[PDB]
Design a binder for this molecule. Sequence first.
Ligand SMILES: Nc1nc2c(ncn2[C@@H]2O[C@H](COP(=O)(O)OP(=O)(O)OP(=O)(O)O)[C@@H](O)[C@H]2O)c(=O)[nH]1
Length: 285
Amino acid sequence: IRLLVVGSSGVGKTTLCDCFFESHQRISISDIVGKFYACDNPYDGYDALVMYDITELKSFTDLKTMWLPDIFLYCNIDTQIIIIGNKKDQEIDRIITRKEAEQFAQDRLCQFYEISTKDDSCQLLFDCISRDFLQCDIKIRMLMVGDQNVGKTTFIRKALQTGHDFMNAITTRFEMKIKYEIIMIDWGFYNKLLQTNPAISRTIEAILIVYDITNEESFQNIHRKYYPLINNKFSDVAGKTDLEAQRKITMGDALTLADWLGYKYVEMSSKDTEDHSSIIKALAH
Ligand SMILES: Nc1nc2c(ncn2[C@@H]2O[C@H](COP(=O)(O)OP(=O)(O)OP(=O)(O)O)[C@@H](O)[C@H]2O)c(=O)[nH]1
């Protein structure tokens, strides 16, 4: 219900929530523009919207440059980022393609919608996010080791992904009755994120690393020893193995678990929701 609108000047918020005449006053709302040291506190009190012109290429290029680092850096693990093409009633005037705008919307882990401030659009978009507020609280971003074999098998419990021929970005929301949302990521998409936004692990809480029989886990750990050391952790077994003594030597850093195939009906549901639940309870204030 607490929102902030950013973006350069050819178009924007003024006209945008000028149509919030419709949505304003059940379900509540508040909207402010970003630009006192105490009044800089409600700045970060958002639940989330950086826009750009489809006509002005410069607005988009400055969404990719001028706007984003602030929004990524200061925002707490909470909220979420929505990227909005305005106009679209101007669609003849689009100099800015939808698929790479949405692709660079995907690669930053942001939601993306092209609207028209004039009519339609608007209230629809608003409606959507309103729903995703009572559909779920917000998201927890978890990462899962992306080595070749076992990942897909672990992820089958999402909706199977092929999709993302390079980097996964998977969604699962289940709980009990606060109904929260958990997003699984893969090791491929993390280093692919770091060229876009370095240290997005500020948004990452749980760390899952899977395994079958032979793996050192050294490299992946020590390269993940940087942005983490807050986190949360589990090592998993998948598939001369299933010996738990040499599991807990690397797991001396973490907690570990062992299972296989579709016996995971519990293990999945056991492991995830375990650490997940702690994310709610363990650190809160
Ligand atoms: N064609 C078209 N123009 C729009 C739309 N929404 C806003 N505008 C135009 O945007 C122009 C000025 O931008 P503003 O609406 O004031 O956006 P802002 O949030 O105040 O940000 P600034 O650009 O700094 O003023 C106005 O002339 C509006 O007509 C839209 O959906 N379609």
